[PDB]
Structures are given as structure tokens and as C-alpha cells.
Amino acid sequence: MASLPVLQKESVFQSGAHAYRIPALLYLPGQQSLLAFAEQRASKKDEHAELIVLRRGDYDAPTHQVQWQAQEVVAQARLDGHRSMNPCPLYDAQTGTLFLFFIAIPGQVTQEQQLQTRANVTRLCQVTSTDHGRTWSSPRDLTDAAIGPAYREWSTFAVGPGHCLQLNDRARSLVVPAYAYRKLHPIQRPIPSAFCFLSHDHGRTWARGHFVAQDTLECQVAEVEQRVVTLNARSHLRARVQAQSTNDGLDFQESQLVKKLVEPPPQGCQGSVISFPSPRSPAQWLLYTHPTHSWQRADLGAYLNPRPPAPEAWSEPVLLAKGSCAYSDLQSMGTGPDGSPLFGCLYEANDYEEIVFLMFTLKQAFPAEY
Ligand SMILES: CC(=O)N[C@H]1[C@H]([C@H](O)[C@H](O)CO)OC(C(=O)O)=C[C@@H]1O
């Protein structure tokens, strides 16, 4: 009945003068620290979003606990007159550059206004850091270069939220998960589909991967090794949509509903997925966190896939948190104190009144594998 006993459970963000939503977590292996991002909003409503905040956490080996420094606004992550949303961090292990992708929307123009008028006013931006997130560059609007001609083809769009991916391909490509409401029919309402922005030159130039042939919203990607990019997306079909790409994110040749991974009504909820070194035939396994309630957003659970990307290989969930739970973001942190893979998890709880940090090992979550 009680949730999973974990190495650590701590509220890193709480409602106060501002509300906090949309967590994003990034582990910096060489720094042994975590970057927890979130949207600082004037209220819980989406259009009241303002800026992006950040807390740097340091993992202490002797105590196997993470101590978090004070939150601070990522001042550079914004466009004049625009509110910032959807933080999507990424660490380029080859250049050491830290990327923070996000979207910027004029004042309080809602997503609904853009959908109803089929008029896109959302911007794709990024800020980078060469000192691991301590200081950030001026924002760069990627809209023209990354979206260009397709801009008029979408009612609106977003990236993430959550951590991105860097492939172990030749060019060490950067992959940013996203979705867009595409204007396909003259009368029918534009349908959203997930896809990935791609960069083969470490963020210098960008291109758009093709759409998952499914009605999908927020998604995240992971790579498993031949080399496959598995995409896990939110959908209104009461189940998650999972798609695989064997051509590094450009196209998703296969996709389907994973009924075992429930989505609450009426339009599901965002979830997170990551790959990590297998404790044993396949090289990597997958971990996925998401609410497990079928009627509302509650009971955050962790699922395991020991034979990725096989949809039928997803395990039954393990209860991570009881009660109201929503968005989450996962990160593989290496080896835990018990010799098994260590994981960090950031998630919205208690009717969006706090964002909780959870840290646990594979041994704790899935002991049957041991
Ligand atoms: C950019 C934006 O408004 N994102 C919002 C997202 C979006 O409405 C949905 O993915 C369909 O477009 O939904 C939710 C949500 O808690 O369900 C909060 C996000 O802030």
C-alpha cells in the first residue's frame, strides 16, 4: 500500500509567490550534479507562465543524497515580450556545451487562441552554456532556421518538455523531441503529431525529422542498441504511443499504442523515458515514469522494459508516489550505492503545488530482476 521506499524524496519547488510546473532534469556526469528546471508561473494556468528557473543539485557519495543549491531564474532564457515555456535541457558530451531549448509565446496568447485561429505565434529558442549551466549565452531564436517553411503548416508547437538526446552515431547528433498541430484538412481541426528536431553539427544547424504517423502530443526519446531511437508519446487514446526509428530520428517506421501504459482522460498526461546499461542479452533497458491512475493524474509509477523496444516487454508499474501526480522527467545517474543503476526523477505533485525530486535504484524498484 505504501509507495516505494527510495534513497531520497524531497520537494525542490513549491508554490509561493509563484507557481511551478513542467520539470526537466539533466544529469552532468563529469560534474556529478543535476540540473532541475521548471517553469515559474504567476499562477497554475498555462498562459500565466513567465520564466524558467533552475536548481543545481550535487550528489554526495558518502551519504548517497543530493543537496540542492537555491533556485535562480535563467534570466537569458527568454524573448522580449514573450513568456518562456517547456524547458528541454541537453548536454553535448563531445563539445561539453550545455543546451536549454524552450519555446517563447507573446504575452498571454493561449495555445487555444493559436489552435482556433490556426495561426502560429510560438517561437523556438535556445541558450547555451560552456560552464555547465552556471551562466548562459544570449537567447537565439531558432524558428527561422529550424522551422522555416513549415511554420505556416502548424497551428502551434512545442519541444519536450524534459531532457533531450544525443545519439552515439557518427556525428553524435542532437535530438530534440517535439510535437506540432498540423493543418492537414481545410475543415477538420489540425491534429498534433510528435517528431524530432535534428542537428548533425552540434547545434549549429537544425532540420525537422518526420512525423510519427499518429495523433500524439508531448514525447521523449531514448536510444537502444542495431541502433534504435524509441519515442514514447502522450495521446488521448487512454494509452501511450510508442514509435521506433531505425534511421536516427528522421523517420519512425513503426508505431503503436501500448495499452499496458495507461493514459488518463481526456487528453492524457506527459511522461518520461530513458535508457540505461542493462544489468546483464540487450545492451540497454528502458525506464518510464508516468501517472498510473486511469481516471485522473495520480499515483506516479515506474515501468521497466528489459527487452526494448518490444512494446509487450513493458513490466507492470511500481508505485513511486501516491496521490496527485502529473509531469515527470527521468535521468540515469550511473551506479547506485547498492551496485545497481541509479535514477533521478523530478515530478509535479499535489495539484501542481510542488515539484518533487525522487532518487532510487533498479534494485529498489525491480528487485525481482536480482
Ligand atoms: C505549451 C503548453 O501550453 N503546454 C501545456 C500542455 C499542452 O496543452 C498539451 O500538451 C496539448 O497541446 O499541457 C499541459 C498539461 O498539463 O496537460 C501543460 C503544458 O504547459
Structural domains of the chain, with CATH: 1-370 (2.120.10.10)
Of 263, 329, 348, 352, which is the active-site residue?
A: 348
Question: Would you state the cell numbers that stand for residue 233, as one nine-digit string?
Answer: 508519446
Task: Confirm whether residue 21 is marked as ligand binding.
Answer: yes
Q: With contact defined as beta carbons under 8 Å apart, do 208 and 148 qualify?
A: no
Q: What are the φ/ψ torsions at residue 46 (nearest 5 degrees)?
A: -50, -45
Whether 158 lines ligand 1, by a CB cut-off of 6 Å, is yes
d(CA 301, CA 322): 9
Q: With contact defined as beta carbons under 8 Å apart, do 138 and 146 qualify?
A: no
DSSP of 207-241? EEPPPPSS---SEEEEEE---EEEEEE--SSSEEE
d(CA 50, CA 239): 31
- Nearest 5 degrees, angle CA 107-CA 328-CA 51? 25
Within 13 Å of residue 3, how many CA atoms lie on the same side as its CB? 19
Q: What are the φ/ψ torsions at residue 292 (nearest 5 degrees)?
A: -110, 0
* Residue 7 CB contacts under 8 Å (≥ 6 apart), including other chains: 64, 65, 336, 337, 342, 359, 360, 361, 364
d(CA 177, CA 231): 8
Q: What is the CA radius of gyration of the chain?
A: 19
| Closest alpha carbon to 220 in 313, 132, 319, 286 | 286
Residues with their C more than 2.5 Å from the N of the next written residue in the chain, i.e. before a break, are 225, 280
- In a 3-state reduction of DSSP, which class is residue 151? helix
Whether 223 lines ligand 1, by a CB cut-off of 6 Å, is no
d(CA 214, CA 224): 22
Distance from the CA of 119 to the center of ligand 1, in angstroms?
A: 17
Q: With contact defined as beta carbons under 8 Å apart, do 59 and 25 qualify?
A: no
d(CA 117, CA 337): 53
Q: With contact defined as beta carbons under 8 Å apart, do 362 and 341 qualify?
A: yes
Atom 11 of ligand 1: nearest residue by CA position: 217
DSSP of 306-353? SSTT-GGG----EEEEEEEEEEEEEEEEEE-TTSSEEEEEEEEETTTT
Beta-bridge partner residues of 145:
none
d(CA 199, CA 205): 6
Atom of ligand 1 nearest to the CA of 86: 1
Whether 105 lines ligand 1, by a CB cut-off of 6 Å, is no
Q: What is the resolution of this structure in A?
A: 2.2
CA distance readout (Å), 16 to 42, 87, 275 = 10, 21, 35
Whether 233 lines ligand 1, by a CB cut-off of 6 Å, is no
Atom of ligand 1 nearest to the CA of 47: 3
CA distance readout (Å), 188 to 83, 116, 181, 332 = 29, 11, 12, 41
Q: Given the C-alpha cell 535508457, which residue does it identify?
A: 275
Whether 46 lines ligand 1, by a CB cut-off of 6 Å, is yes
Q: Is 131 a catalytic residue?
A: no
Determination technique for this entry = X-ray
Task: Confirm whether residue 189 is marked as ligand binding.
Answer: no
Q: Is 348 a catalytic residue?
A: yes
Of 20, 59, 91, 327, which is the active-site residue?
A: 327
